[PDB]
Symmetry: D2
Subunit: 225 residues, 4 copies
């Protein structure tokens, strides 16, 4: 509907503006939409995204470690599989179809904007609890969902149709909704039904906001091969 | 064959005697073999093992976080699924078929011997690297493999046939072998082909030995509902 | 006064009965009070407490890592020094005055009851946030404070006067009060003034209760050299 | 002498060129040397360095947690004090003497280059062992030592004399040497006397190299208020 990824995400998104818009309506995203993004920039982004996925997968495994209920653990385990026995292996196939070797991929030098983001999310998770970690992971998961859904409606080229159909597709949208349910359930379990009244709420929104800014930096990196 | 779970395990096992024998030939295990273990002791063990599996699953998720190669991560992810989208949900079914409610299971008070062991393994993993963690996890994985394989050959009752056929069965044996390959590959990657010449080797054997002793304590707990 | 270590501790203590009494009025403690505890049991306890202090010091260093404010960090840093550039080095001197070598001390085999407790506290800290960690550490800090203060008033022998005067003395009592202030301030910062109304509160009391039970196990270990 | 901070640092430094030179002979550093760095850039750097020190202090507390010997722990505890009961409180005094409020300091928005670096070091420490963490911390500690020592000999202005005399002074140089001894001792304990023959050695040099590049980014941030 209006707010397809749960209550907590909708509230965090609203507190993260205007960075959220700068992220989801970034020039890189507009290039994907119109098929005007240069190939070189897309391929650079793919290679860096391969490294990003390694560390993002580790962060989702950390969410399992930080889970308190079997339910939390299963949702996180589900996402680790959605990434490590699916999205990563497909992604390598996409790089490979676009010309990038497997040895060259493995030697990918991680850009600062990439490292900044994944180390931010991992450290948030190690130092805080599951809610800190989910706050840090949400902008990636839900932002790609929102961008994919929009571009499914608005793309004027199929050049980047595979990317768009990945994030706009039912499987990915369902995974976003599942993460939204996890976030809502984790918040309510720990902080109560009125979770926005906890002092923690401001911290969590700040973590989400920081991760949103780091996403903007990742797209800017993508434009600067 | 002789040494079915890889080189590192065979070497650690040999350094962990006589605790290793005290673990794999424990009175609790002999009760399973002969079908003489009392029902009350088995059911108590099942309930505690349900809690143990929660934390052991988290420890295997930690192994993903501590992985350096896609290969390490996939092996660990594989094991988390073997535990969290399989062994845990089956285990609840076994408790449930034996009479234990789902609410009562969720309120299971963790025994000290249980907590000692899982917190030992988790802390080893958080504080050390992947090798520390695998050293701590190996006695559980491979010990159950060795016990199941033996009891498949030696059981004189089918009373505990489901337990025996779980750990003696091809799926579990294959999973043990996979963990053995991971341990060997992780050791060689980090410490080199002559990994027993690293000063780390003695530390890792000590961690494995401690975890073996904690297994002996877990079986002793099982006998003392 | 009545409740000398802050509001949160007083509330957690009350939720941890009757384990709290079993801890602070344990037979080992009564032996210290009356000077009837056997020397062999005291020396065994000292050696195990040397290992305990290593890991407890690491847990207080973890509290620094998990701190959010300069104030939290300074309080934790203060306690790490109170332990690592003071209590540990004095403790070695006490073992040494009682006959135990420095090499034999370093080879101290950690008892299960000891390991259980320190790994419990460390894992709570790594997996949760600062509040989980402080909940787990509080029974050690404040329990020794309460026992030392009582035994200062009630001891009928000076045999264990050094131990009693350590924990009953102004320096240690001041350190207990400082930890109580940290716990109260950390709770209020994260959960608000009405922190007992957070769903987290029950979890934290449970962690504190578990650690109190593990203390009872540590004294029982002490009686069983 | 030639190589004043121990064997391991000298070897890592040599593997990190030319980034090491780009770090220690950065334009920002040349501005400090000649007193030509603009005040605005220096003050921006001070404020960001206040946040950096918070997280760097946490990373040194993590080194305590990851220590295996009392000696390792004491060296790390020593450094946490050198930072948290000394350098941080002095640093606030320096900001304050240069005009920056205490409330405005506390609201310091962390730059991406700052966050990238501290989250990199913390995550390295959480995910790896003490050696990973020290490899990540060494460029900060020893680089400031090398820069301070050089600028003590080569500065043509006293404008930034306080900064130069901090890092060039005997106390800081002694602290650098102490960290060098810790790094050498930790390496030899874990990997043996021939530690450069371990496969780990290449990983550790890479971590150190990455952190050196992140230092270059921090100085570049400093030039871009
Ligand atoms: Cl690239
Ligand atoms: Cl039970
Ligand atoms: Cl002892
Ligand atoms: Cl600034």
């Amino acid at each position: 509907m209006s707010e397809p990824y749960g209550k907590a995400f909708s509230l965090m998104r609203a507190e993260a503006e205007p960075a959220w818009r700068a992220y989801t309506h970034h020039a890189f995203v507009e290039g994907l939409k119109a098929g005007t993004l240069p190939r070189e920039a897309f391929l650079h982004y793919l290679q860096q995204d391969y490294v990003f996925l390694i560390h993002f997968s580790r962060a989702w495994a950390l969410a399992v470690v930080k889970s308190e209920t079997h339910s939390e653990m299963l949702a996180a385990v589900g996402t680790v599989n959605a990434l490590v026995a699916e999205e990563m292996q497909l992604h390598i196939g996409i790089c490979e179809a676009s010309g990038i070797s497997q040895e060259a991929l493995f030697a990918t030098r991680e850009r600062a904007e990439n490292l900044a983001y994944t180390r931010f999310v991992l450290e948030a998770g190690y130092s805080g609890d599951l809610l800190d970690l989910l706050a840090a992971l949400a902008p990636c998961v839900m932002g790609y969902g929102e961008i994919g859904k929009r571009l499914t409606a608005e793309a004027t080229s199929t050049l980047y149709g595979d990317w768009i159909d990945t994030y706009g597709g039912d499987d990915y949208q369902a995974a976003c909704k599942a993460v939204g349910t996890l976030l809502d359930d984790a918040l309510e379990r720990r902080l109560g039904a009125e979770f926005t009244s906890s002092p923690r709420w401001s911290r969590l929104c700040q973590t989400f906001h920081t991760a949103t800014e780091l996403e903007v930096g990742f797209w800017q990196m993508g434009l600067t091969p």
